[PDB]
Every structure is written in structure tokens, then in C-alpha cells.
Design a protein around this ligand. Structure first.
Ligand SMILES: [Zn+2]
Lengths: 363, 63, 140
RNA sequence: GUCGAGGUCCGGGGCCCCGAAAAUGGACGGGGCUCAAGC
RNA sequence: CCGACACAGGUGCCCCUGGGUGAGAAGCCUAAGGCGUGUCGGGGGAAACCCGGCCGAGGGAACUCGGCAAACUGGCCCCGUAACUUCGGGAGAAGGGGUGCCUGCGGGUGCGUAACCCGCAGGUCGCAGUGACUAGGGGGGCCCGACUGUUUAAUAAAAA
RNA sequence: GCAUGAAUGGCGUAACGAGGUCCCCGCUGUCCCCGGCCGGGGCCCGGCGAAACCUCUGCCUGGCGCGCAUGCCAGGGACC
RNA sequence: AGUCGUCUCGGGCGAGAGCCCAUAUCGACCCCGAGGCUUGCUACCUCGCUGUCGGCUCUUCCCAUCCUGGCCCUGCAGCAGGGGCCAAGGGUGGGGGUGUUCACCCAUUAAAGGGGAACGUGAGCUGGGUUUAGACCGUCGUGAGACAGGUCGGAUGCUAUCUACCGGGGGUGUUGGCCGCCUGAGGGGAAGGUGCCCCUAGUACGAGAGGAACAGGGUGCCGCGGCCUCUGGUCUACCGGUUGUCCUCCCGGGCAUCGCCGGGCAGCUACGCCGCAGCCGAUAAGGCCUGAAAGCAUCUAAGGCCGAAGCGGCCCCCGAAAAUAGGCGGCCGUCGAGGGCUCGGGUAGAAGACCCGGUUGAUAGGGCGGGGAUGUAAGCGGGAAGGGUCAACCGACCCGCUUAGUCCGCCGCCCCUAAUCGCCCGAG
């Protein structure tokens, strides 16, 4: 008989709707330097640039076209510290401490006709995600809880520590409900990690402070949804003979006589898209500040194309320009981590030479 | 990083866009879009459409 | 560096689209005696189930002469495609097209069997095959 | 031709070993069993 | 009315058909006349898939038992038409050019600048002028039966 | 000429054919390789409302068996 | 289904051929087996009905391995060959005649391996072959007729009852309820496979012709998972031209597939673009170290080292119903935290579900502005091939006001309008 590879891959089954619209990171890289291992942003749109290639290959030193994706990256708020001990079958959280309520200043309040400014505060936007926050939680209580956690670390029951951070869509005026994420910290010593998280508890983190230009990353997000799709589109089966009187976009035979059952491997219709996916080795071309990209120390250009990004507003905060495309619809929350399985001859860790940036109307 | 100029509408277009069409005689024509390319090959006169640079030349020709 | 100047083939940084499947009629653009050929295969290409081999610019194909002088008709030959109608992208991102599907008859090692080429020769094919570009008149 | 304790063959008997490749995942009934829970 | 039915069949297409385009009782639009009862309604980027329809880059039968299905041509005027032949045909062979609108002239029959046809010159617009609708694709070999016609009502229309 | 043949006719034949059969130009989603769009179903809601069929029931691997078992044997798995 | 005569594939002995040399390779005459992949034999189940060959679609398995990984012998100089071993992760393709499986042939390729799954797969398709009813030819028969002989034509029914797999929801339980973030027992993966090119190198080897390898770089093809910045399709939103007809003519409209035709942003798309680890651990075939039985020798008996595209992990996807039914922070209970319907919308969607917003407000509408798609609107003035008393007047069409007009399933600012009122469950 004639052989051929099977239609589609079995390594992404079941092809079901993602458990949570907020992506989860299962594995983290091993880095000596002490820093947060990743960041979060919102997908804005796509554009292209012309750059002198510095990555190894045939096209080295020659100007090349390059598509890039824009992620708006408002600063994250570090508002929790969590500790992990070693359980019987794996890591188990031992304790977790969140900072007490503090006033919120970066809220873009508007003065409407009547009434004063809303005068928002933390624990008020966070309620939209948690809905059950501490009451009468004071600085002394927080200090004693931190001391207890530090004493536990000193005793040595703690094998890991991680940071609880929150997004701030309100500063960019996207929405108000924040997304809470848990991030591992690079390094080796739990004491160093604890000090690093503690010094930033209740404060802000910037992608400029976290990541490095020209480094490889992995992008995690939930892909665009397609609804129910037949096998032709879901798995890539071949259309049946044009003379078929019972349809063309269906599998011919769903199994032999024996086994007397339908094998799970037979392509079939179902959910397509909205899957949790990870893309490896995506280069971080640039990091821009306040929606502006600096080219030659005397030229700066607004990254927003004329008329704005389609189905998106205007980039007003820090942002990331990455090579290639990324999963997720527009405005999706995108997580990025340092390269987990990078190649051996990596590109230099520095911004490339960008000769042109496209800001023409993309609509 | 150079802005080519369309052969039909006479306007420049940004790098990384458009196309170049080669004639059998070696003449090369730059087209900024399928609209311009199709109009050129169909034969619509560029000198009667106000949204082209040839229209100004035609206006000068006719006074 | 073996065959420093005697090398017949080179490398190109651009890979044109494979817009010419098996069974397509290519116009012969040199003076080898052939006028029209039909693609029957593509060398250095692996297909899959029910997939016809496709060729672009700068890739060798196996063909048979349909129209030409009696000495050359009904002969299995190797032809290198030099012009295709399907636009393909360059390094700067711009598309380049041509007016006809034109190829040049060459030996299996890549040495042309003619002396002249009529019409422009794609820079991709010229770079891939040194001799074709060397004997070509105008390279676009 | 020097050491200085048993060698060198043959025909047989018991157990075991090689010879010993198949298609849904799996058959000492199963778990498992080595001075035995085998012979 | 018949078919068990308020049955998309049959009986009855049995007798008749204003205006425009057009050769036309064609196709399309419309007047008179009739109807909203070829009788369950509402919702929806509300999917996959199925049936009817439109388009599709580059290649052009590589699909398939087999070009099944679809596509190409398509009306009118002019030129120009092969092998073969039972001299009547083949034949609209094949193949090529033109086609709108506007401003006027000339010709036919006519008492008439009434009515219907037939040519000429100029100007001009579009990718496209039989612009919708209507509307042949073509050629070369072989077997069978001369031709028109008839046949298994309900799997065979054929060389029978 | 296993095993053609002269009126159960032999041979040839212009014109004709929804007859069988081969080739060429042109055309095209038949195919490379499938992708969009339109209307009707499919789907939900309010109504009228059946029929074919039906021993009882209904997960698997290797076996026994009238030799190809959801129901038996030893095992595996399984909330509704 | 049983059997394996036959079929396919192994083994024992070694006459002989190989310059000598039985075993590099072939191996007579004889003999012992394995499989159930050819055919046959039997008649054990199935004739109150289990639809055939071939092709297409799709899934899966065996090794007696064609290539891809690693090795041993060679009558193995190199490049290549012959024989054999471990190894089933991946591939094994495209065409011509023929209904063909098969076989033959063509051009490529690393290779274009043989088979099992009711000769897998017709409640999936097609119906070319086979096997009814019509008909012709040859042969046989007195005849009606027959032919495992050709030839033309000849129908393929379905509203899923249970289970099965693909995805989507509502509950119970997990010793009170609820919101959030996690852990990862287990299951899935090929997420990768494989060519060519440059150097090593015209070097090793070789008389010469010819001609490697380790290491180091580049890139193609097949497969997989994503995206629409660029290019192409579509775009029955939208803009323009135009044919017939109707609304009396002008503007503006209906119908004629969206009437036809050209362009077309958002959206979807591929023919477009981006991404896909070689490191560690133990091993099979195989190569060695120490060492006796058997004072020597010996890779093996005890013991140790290295050694495969194969196995386990790193990596990706699902994953608290993981019955040992998990961890932590917080809130509530012993009226009441946390939710549901209703409300304005898609980062979603067949119903459910999911996601944003809800006066603590820019969610939608509206107004303005930006950015786009067509292509310069109606009206007026002038010209216009010509006609007309060569006057008035008619005139297809052109020019200026006019980057116009029309529209926008995109974006920004402004609370002007509607996101209101209300109802319900809920642990004790
Ligand atoms: Zn242009």
C-alpha cells in the first residue's frame, strides 16, 4: 500500500477549550542571575521593519524585511510573596503573604459633571479578581507575617519562593479587572530570592528592568478561537472524491471491523483554536518607552501606526517589539519567559540595526 | 530602505511593499498595488484620473 | 578550495516560490534548438502522497521537447527555470514578477547547451548557476 | 626437562542451554515464586 | 375531477393573449386581471456538515475505467472555406474582421419629411458595445447500423 | 484464420447517430490544494405531532465454545 | 475454522566450484523444522439472507529491515560490492498502457520492503471488472439452447435504540460554605525525520584512473503548531461604469444570478510569513579490562569499562474523581460571605459555557476628529462633431467649482442617550 504521515499530531490532545484564559507556565529556565523570569503584556498588533541581520546564517550583514509584533506592557505590580516546601510527591505551598492596602495613584481618574474624583485605591481593583480580601489588615500584621515567613526560610522548610504580581489594564485604559500571576525568580539561594521579592513588594516592575533586548524568549498565550471545525480544517484530511454523493469534507472510514470500536486517533470534528500554546525561541527586537521608539539617539517615533492599531487603541505605555507572530487574538494577555531550550549559536544580546520602521496605516 | 515610485500613480510607496514587473525587453515597472497594476495592464488612461501625478501633467498640457 | 573557478553552481539567499508543477509548458529562451518543453520531474525534491513536484526560479527540472528542430524533439533534457509569472519575495520584502515561464536547457551538471539567452535572466537563477549568469546578456 | 598431585579418553544417565520470527495490549487462571511457591 | 390526501403526478394547453427590447407565441421588465393559500411562524457572524449558486493566484487532465461535472464558443453583417462524395452534400467545415451612443446625409417601396427596411461620413465614451437577457465550441482516425422512425410503462434506447 | 467468407450474404461506402472507440488545438477547481462568499436546511425558542424498529440488557485484552462473545473464565478499567 | 501436500523462510552434513583453501561467496545428493503472508484438501459455524474484485478516504499492528542509526566477516586498497548481527522512532513518493491486485516501462529519489486487521474499511464513497433480465460475433448442438470465449448496455434504500470515539454542559462526593493562586500521581507526542552544498581535500588510499572520513558552517524537502505586517483569493459591507425594461423626462430608485463588469478596507484564508534541544542515564548488536575452572591460554563463569535514529529524562499538550478524592492565603457560619436570572457588548460561541463593562462608567448608540475604500457627485458656467432662418434652440461627450461626493462590520475625545428597576439560590 501507499504510505504517508498521519493527518495532524497526537501530541496536542485533547483539543479542548483552554482551562483558563490566563495562560499557565509549567516549567521555568535555570538562570544564575537574580531576576524575575518573565513578564506579561497585551497583544496590540503587527507591523514590519527593515534591519541589518546579525543572526548567523546566509543573510548576515544584509538588510532584510522582518515582521514584528507589538505587546503593550504597562508596569506590573508586585503584591505577594509565596513560599514552597518539599512535599511527599512534589512542591507544596507553605505560606503566602500579600501587602496591605495602599493608595493607587496611577489610576486615570476623570472629573465628570458632579461628584469629586473617585479617589481609587488598591484592594478595590483587585476585588474584581479575588472578591475576598483581608480586612483590618495593618502594617504590623504584614510585618509579623513576613517575619514568620523569613523564620521559616531560616529553619529551612522552604525550598522555593515566588512572586505574586498583578496586571494594571487601567493605566493604559484597556479595562479594570486585573490578572494575577505567579512568577518564579531566577537564582539559587532562597534567601537571595526572598530579599529580591521583599524589596519590591508593593512596588512596580518595568519590562525594561526585567528583560534584555535581543534575547530569546518563549511566548505563552491562548490562541484565537475558531469554534467547531470539521476534520478537513481541524486535522488536514484530504477531500473525498468529487463524485461522492454523501459529502466531501468528511473522513471516509472511521475504522476497520476489528477492533470493534472507534479508535481515539481517527480525525473528528470538535473545538479548534482557543488552546494553550507555547512558542519557543522568539527574539526580542526592542523595548520602547511610553509608546515611543528611539532609533539613533536623536530620532524617536511613535510606534502606533496612523489611525491606530486595528481593533485596538493607541500604545501609550512601555511595549515590546518581538520578531515574528505570536498566538492570541487582539488584546489577549501574553506571557513571556526567557528561552527555555535556546539554540547553541544564539544571536547577540543587543538591539539590531533598524533602518526603517513601518508606521503607515495598517487598516 | 528606499521608497520606490509607482509607475501608474507616480507616488512613492514604503519599503517592503509593492512589486516589480519585468518586461521581456528589460523594462522594469514598479506597482504600489494590485489596483495600479491591473489598471495599467487593462489600459485605463492615468491622465484622466485626478488621484495620479500624470493628471497634473495632462492639465499642464491642456493649459 | 576545490574547483575555485571551475565551479558550476552557487548559493542564493532567496528561495523563489515553486509555482510550476509537473506538466507545465516552459518556453526555451536560448539557442539550443528547442522552443517549448514540458516539465516531467524536479531534481533534488521529495514529494508526498498525491503531490506533484513543483519548481520555481533557479531550480533544475527534467523535461521533454515538444516543439523544436528534429534533432532535439522527443528528447529528455534538463532545464533551469529563469523566469516565472508567479511573483516571489526578495530580501527587502518586495515582490518580483516576470512576463512568461521561461527556462534554459543545460547539462545535468549545469553547463548550458546553448550560447545565448534571449530576454532577462532572474538574479536568483544567475546567482545559483554561475555559467548561466556569465553567458546571460541582461540580468534583472 | 625442570617443577610435583592426579591426569587423558571413550560410551552412557538427570536437569538445563542454543537451534526458537507475527500481526489490538496480556496471559503458568492471576499475583507472584530461586536450599522454591520449580523438578 | 382520478390517483386512500387541501398528492410538485395525470386529466385540460381544451379554446384566447396589451406595451418595450427583440425574427419571434423565446428570455427579461411591465399594463389589465389575479394573488400574498405552490400556507407553520420567530431568533442568529448561532458553528461543523449537507444540498442549490458565484468567484478563485501559478500550472492546465498530472484526476479518473473513461475530460463524469464544469469551462471555452455563442446573435447578426462581411470576407473565406478542406479530405471525401451517391454531385444533392460535407457547410454555419475550418479560419479572420466588425458590432454602443450622438450629429447629419444618401437609397428602396411609397402622394407623403406617414410606415418598414438598406448604406455612407464625422465626433465621442469604457476593461468590456449580440455590455443584461437570448445565444453552436472545434478538428482528425476506426467498428457497427444506410437514412427519418420503433422498443423491454418501473435498472438495458442499443450494433436490437 | 484454436474457431472468416459470399442473400443466417462478402467487401466498400457519401450523408446521418443523446450508439461503442482513439488522438490533437482550446477550455477549465477533475487534479496539485484547497480557500472565501450567497440563499435553503442543520442549531435554539413557540405550536401540530408520528413511523421503521424493539427477547432482556448493553466497557475491554487473551482464551473456552456450534471454531469471529457487551453477558462465560482470568485479568484491566470505569462517579452519575 | 483444522492441516501444511504446495507456498514463503530458516537449519544439520559437506561432494564439489573457488590459482592451494569446504565454509569470502555458491553449495549438489540427502535429512530436520518455522509461519499461516499462494494454492489445495476437509466440510466444523453461517443459505426464515453476514452485499463481491479493484480504486479513493482513514486508523492501527508484526519483522523474515528497502532507506535512515550502530556493528562483524570478506577473494574488504579508496570509491563501491557480497554475506551476516542489533534495531520497527520516521519514510518508503509521481506517472503510461490495462477494471485490474500483480507484473512491465519512464523520470526523479537515501529508499521508492513484504504483510496482518472478516483477502481492514460499500448503515464512508465509486461502480471500471465479476454474476440476472436486452443484443452481436466465433464454436458446439437437428432443436429449444450452451460456452471458468470475446463484445455494447444495465438500480447501490437509513429519522442512531445501546455502546464506541470527538468536542461541549448540569450534578453528587471528596466530613461546613465560598473567591483566588498553585502542586503534578498519571495519560498523549515524531515534534521532529531526512537530503544536498562549502571546507577537511583533489588530502588519506591507490601504479594510474579514481577517490574518502572525524570535526566545523549553510540550506532545501516532508511533518507539526501558530499569525495576517507583506503578496494572492474571496469580501451578495461599500464605491464606480453600463445593457433591457418600469416609476412621465432631469436627479434618485425596483427587477433582470449581486442584472453584467472593474476596484475593494475589516474578517477568513495560503499560493504568504514566523517557531520546532542535542545533552545527560542505563542498555541491544558489537569492542575491551581483570580472572579461574583447565598451574598456561581465555571478554565470562564471579566482577568492571565503553557502546545504537532504539529505551527513561530534560521539552510541549490534558491533568484534584489522583478513593491516600491534594496544598496555601483570605472571607463567611456555628441574619448571612459568595453566586444566578435580568442589562450594554465579543478577546467567545450550535444550546450551555467563556470574556469585558455595568454610574465605583467610555460597554454600545450619538456628535466631532483621525485613518481608510472607490474615484471627482448633484447643480451651474463654458466648449463640443454638426443641424437649424447656418438665428433662437438641440447635441453624445469634455473642461472648472472638485482629492470631490458616497460609505466605512476600524481608531481617539465628549456621559448627550441606554447599561435601570426587580426577582431567586445559598453553608449554618
Ligand atoms: Zn500606484
Amino acid at each position: 500500500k501507499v504510505h504517508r504521515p498521519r493527518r495532524g499530531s497526537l501530541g496536542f490532545s485533547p483539543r479542548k477549550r483552554a482551562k483558563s484564559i490566563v495562560p499557565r507556565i509549567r516549567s521555568w529556565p535555570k538562570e544564575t542571575e537574580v531576576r524575575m523570569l518573565g513578564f506579561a503584556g497585551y497583544k496590540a498588533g503587527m507591523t514590519h521593519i527593515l534591519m541589518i541581520d546579525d543572526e548567523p546564517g546566509l543573510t548576515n550583514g544584509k538588510e532584510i524585511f522582518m515582521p514584528v509584533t507589538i505587546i503593550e506592557t504597562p508596569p506590573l505590580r508586585v503584591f505577594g510573596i509565596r513560599a514552597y516546601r518539599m512535599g511527599y510527591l512534589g512542591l507544596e505551598t507553605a505560606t503566602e503573604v500579600i501587602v496591605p492596602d495602599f493608595p493607587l495613584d496611577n489610576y486615570p481618574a476623570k472629573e465628570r459633571k458632579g461628584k469629586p474624583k473617585p479617589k481609587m485605591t488598591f484592594y478595590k481593583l483587585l476585588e474584581r479578581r479575588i472578591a475576598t480580601l483581608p480586612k483590618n489588615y495593618t502594617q504590623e500584621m504584614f510585618e509579623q507575617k513576613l517575619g514568620q515567613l523569613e523564620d521559616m526560610i531560616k529553619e529551612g522548610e522552604i525550598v522555593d519562593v515566588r512572586a505574586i504580581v498583578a496586571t494594571q489594564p487601567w493605566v493604559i485604559k484597556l479595562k479594570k479587572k486585573p490578572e494575577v500571576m505567579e512568577y518564579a525568580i531566577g537564582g539559587t539561594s532562597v534567601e537571595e530570592k526572598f530579599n529580591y521579592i521583599k524589596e519590591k513588594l508593593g512596588k512596580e516592575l518595568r519590562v525594561g528592568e526585567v528583560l534584555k533586548e535581543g534575547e530569546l524568549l518563549d511566548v505563552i498565550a491562548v490562541t484565537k478561537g475558531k469554534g467547531t471545525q470539521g476534520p478537513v480544517k481541524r486535522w488536514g484530511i484530504k477531500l473525498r472524491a468529487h463524485k461522492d454523493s454523501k459529502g466531501r469534507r468528511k473522513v471516509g472510514s472511521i475504522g476497520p471491523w476489528h477492533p470493534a470500536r472507534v479508535m481515539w486517533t481517527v480525525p473528528m470534528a470538535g473545538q479548534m483554536g482557543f488552546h494553550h500554546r507555547t512558542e519557543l525561541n522568539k527574539r526580542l527586537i526592542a523595548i520602547g518607552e511610553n509608546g515611543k521608539l528611539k532609533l539613533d539617539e536623536n530620532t524617536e517615533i511613535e510606534i502606533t501606526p496612523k489611525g491606530g492599531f486595528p481593533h485596538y487603541g493607541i500604545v501609550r505605555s512601555d511595549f515590546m517589539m518581538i520578531a515574528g507572530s505570536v498566538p492570541g487574538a487582539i488584546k489577549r494577555i501574553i506571557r513571556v519567559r526567557p528561552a527555555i531550550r535556546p539554540p547553541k549559536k544564539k544571536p547577540p544580546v543587543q538591539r539590531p540595526q533598524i533602518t526603517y520602521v513601518s508606521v503607515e496605516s495598517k487598516q | 530602505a528606499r521608497w520606490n515610485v509607482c509607475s501608474y500613480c507616480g507616488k512613492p510607496f514604503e519599503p517592503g511593499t509593492g512589486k516589480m514587473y519585468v518586461r521581456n525587453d528589460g523594462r522594469v515597472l514598479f506597482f504600489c498595488s494590485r489596483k495600479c497594476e491591473r489598471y495599467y495592464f487593462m489600459g485605463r488612461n492615468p491622465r484622466k484620473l485626478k488621484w495620479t501625478k500624470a493628471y497634473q501633467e495632462a492639465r499642464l498640457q491642456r493649459g | 578550495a576545490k574547483k575555485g573557478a571551475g565551479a558550476t553552481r552557487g548559493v542564493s539567499a532567496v528561495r523563489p516560490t515553486r509555482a510550476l508543477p509537473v506538466g507545465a509548458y516552459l518556453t526555451v529562451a536560448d539557442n539550443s534548438g528547442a522552443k517549448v518543453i514540458q516539465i516531467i520531474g524536479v531534481v533534488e525534491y521529495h514529494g508526498t502522497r498525491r503531490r506533484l513536484a513543483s519548481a520555481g526560479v533557479g531550480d533544475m527540472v527534467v523535461a521533454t521537447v515538444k516543439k523544436g528542430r528534429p534533432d532535439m524533439r522527443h528528447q529528455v533534457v534538463r532545464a533551469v527555470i529563469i523566469r516565472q509569472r508567479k511573483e516571489y519575495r526578495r530580501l527587502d520584502g518586495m515582490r518580483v514578477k516576470f512576463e512568461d515561464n521561461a527556462a534554459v536547457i543545460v547539462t545535468p551538471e549545469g553547463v548550458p547547451r546553448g550560447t545565448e539567452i534571449r530576454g532577462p535572466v532572474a538574479r536568483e537563477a544567475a546567482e545559483r548557476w554561475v555559467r548561466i549568469g556569465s553567458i546571460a546578456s541582461i540580468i534583472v
